[PDB]
């Protein structure tokens, strides 16, 4: 149950549930999920946080 995608753009997590990641940067988002912030796991640094879903793309 988990897609992976690509940032688009950097960004600087606007909340402290938020991630911050860089533009190319992977993450795995969990399948069930809508609304405009996904919950994340970078694969670069195995954090975990809310992104804005329209920063990123399917890989």
């Known amino acids: ?3 992976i995608f ?3 753009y950097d960004y ?5 549930e938020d991630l911050s ?3 190319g940067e992977r993450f795995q988002i ?3 999920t809508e609304g405009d912030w996904w919950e994340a ?6 954090k975990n946080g809310y992104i804005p879903s329209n920063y990123v793309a399917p890989a």
Do not use: P, Q, W
């Not at 600087?12 to 402290?16: N, V």
């Not at 796991?41 to 195995?46: K, L, N, P, Q, W």
């Open 1 to 3: 149950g988990v897609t």
């Open 6 to 8: 690509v940032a688009l």
């Open 12 to 16: 600087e997590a606007r909340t402290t």
């Open 21 to 23: 990641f860089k533009k």
């Open 30 to 32: 969990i399948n069930n």
């Open 41 to 46: 796991r970078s694969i670069a640094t195995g």
